[PDB]
C-alpha cells in the first residue's frame, strides 16, 4: 500500500528486453538493414553487470593494460550488450598482443556458456587505456576496420581506468567506425575522420532494480545529507549551455530537433525540481522541530 505498485511477479518492457527471439534475430540477420546505409546504429545499451565486470578487470590490471570480450545482441536500430568476459592477456601498458592463450580461451568460454544455457554471441571487445583518454589508436583503427568489415555486427569499447578512479565517473566509450572510402577535436586523436563516437545507455531488470535499491538503502546519512544541485552545478550549467545550442539549431532548422530539445529541457527541469524537493523535505523534517 505504501509503495502502491510493489512487485510480486509483474514486470514491464524493462524486463522484456532480456530474452532471445530466435525468429526475430534470424530475420534481422538475413535482412541486413545496416549493410545499406553507413549511418546505422547510434544507440548502444549495456547492462550493469557487464559494466562492473569490465571495471574490476581494468582495476585488477593495475597500471598495465587489459583486454576482453563482450556478449549481447542487436535489436532494430539499437545494440544490446549484457555480458562481460575477461581474457588472460599480458603486455606493457602501451601495447598488448592476443597470444594463443586468448584464442583458446574465447572459444572455450563460449562453449562453457553454451553448456550453461547462454545463447548470446560475440558482439565486440573492450580495451583499457591507462591514462591517455579514450580514443582508438592506429592499430585499433585497423583492427576495427577488419572486424567491422568481416563481422559486420560489431562495436569497440574503450575505457580509462586511471581517470575513472581519479575523477569518480566512468570512462565508458562505445565506438563504431565508418568503412573505407566514405570521407565526409584534438582529443579524439588524428584519425577523427576514420572513426566516430556513439551514445551510451544502461538498463537493469526489475529484480536487479529492487536488489540495487535495497542494497543502496544502507546509505541513509548520505541520502538525506547530500543536498544535490550544490555539487552538480557545473554539470547543470553545461547542460543549459548545450540546451541553448540545441535551441538555436532547432530555430535555424525551422527556418525533429525541437522534440529532442524539449526532452532535454524536461530532463534538466525535472532534475532541478527534484533537488528543490529534497531540500524542502529536509528543511521540513529537521528545521521545524522544537521551535
Amino acid at each position: 500500500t505504501w509503495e502502491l505498485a510493489n512487485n510480486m511477479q509483474e514486470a514491464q518492457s524493462i524486463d522484456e528486453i532480456y530474452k532471445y527471439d530466435k525468429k526475430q534475430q534470424q530475420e534481422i540477420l538475413a535482412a541486413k538493414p545496416w549493410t545499406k546505409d553507413h549511418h546505422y546504429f547510434k544507440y548502444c545499451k549495456i547492462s550493469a553487470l557487464a559494466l562492473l565486470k569490465m571495471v574490476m578487470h581494468a582495476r585488477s590490471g593495475g597500471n598495465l593494460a587489459v583486454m576482453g570480450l563482450m556478449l549481447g545482441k542487436v535489436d532494430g536500430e539499437t545494440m544490446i550488450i549484457m555480458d562481460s568476459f575477461a581474457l588472460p592477456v599480458e603486455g606493457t601498458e602501451t601495447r598488448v598482443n592476443a597470444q594463443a592463450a586468448a584464442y583458446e580461451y574465447m572459444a572455450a568460454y563460449i562453449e562453457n556458456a553454451k553448456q550453461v544455457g547462454r545463447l548470446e554471441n560475440a558482439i565486440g571487445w573492450y580495451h583499457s587505456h591507462p591514462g591517455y583518454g579514450c580514443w582508438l589508436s592506429g592499430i585499433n583503427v585497423s583492427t576495427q576496420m577488419l572486424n567491422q568489415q568481416f563481422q559486420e555486427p560489431f562495436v569497440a569499447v574503450v575505457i580509462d581506468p586511471t581517470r575513472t578512479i581519479s575523477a569518480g565517473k566512468v570512462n565508458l566509450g562505445a565506438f563504431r567506425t565508418y568503412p573505407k572510402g566514405y570521407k565526409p577535436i584534438e582529443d579524439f586523436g588524428v584519425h577523427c575522420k576514420q572513426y566516430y563516437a556513439l551514445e551510451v545507455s544502461y538498463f537493469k531488470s526489475s529484480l536487479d532494480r529492487k536488489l540495487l535499491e535495497l542494497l543502496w538503502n544502507k546509505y541513509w546519512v548520505n541520502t538525506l545529507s547530500s543536498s544535490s544541485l550544490l555539487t552538480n552545478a557545473d554539470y547543470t550549467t553545461g547542460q543549459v549551455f548545450d540546451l541553448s545550442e540545441k535551441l538555436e539549431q532547432s530555430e535555424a532548422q525551422l527556418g525533429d530537433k525541437l522534440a529532442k530539445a524539449t526532452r532535454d529541457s524536461c530532463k534538466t527541469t525535472i532534475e532541478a525540481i527534484h533537488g528543490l524537493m529534497s531540500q524542502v523535505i529536509k528543511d521540513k523534517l529537521f528545521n521545524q522541530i522544537n521551535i
Binding site: 505504501w2 502502491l4 505498485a5 523535505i281 521540513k284 523534517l285 521545524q288 522541530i289 522544537n290
Partner: protein
Amino acid sequence: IEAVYTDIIQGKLDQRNQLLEVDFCIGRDIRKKDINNIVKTLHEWCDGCEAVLLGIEQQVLRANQY
C-alpha cells in the same frame, strides 16, 4: 579560547558581529526529574517524521494517478 582548547565545545568567534557560534556542545548533567521533558521532545520529532511520511505517500499516489 581556553574552553575550546579543553574541548568541551566546538565553535568559532566573530568580532565583527560580536558573536560566538557553536557547532557542537557536550550535554551537561541531567537530574532524575527532567527526563520526561526529554521524552516529549523525542515524541515531537517522531510525530513530525510520521507526518512527513504520510505526505510523501499522498504525493506519490497523486503523481502516479496523473
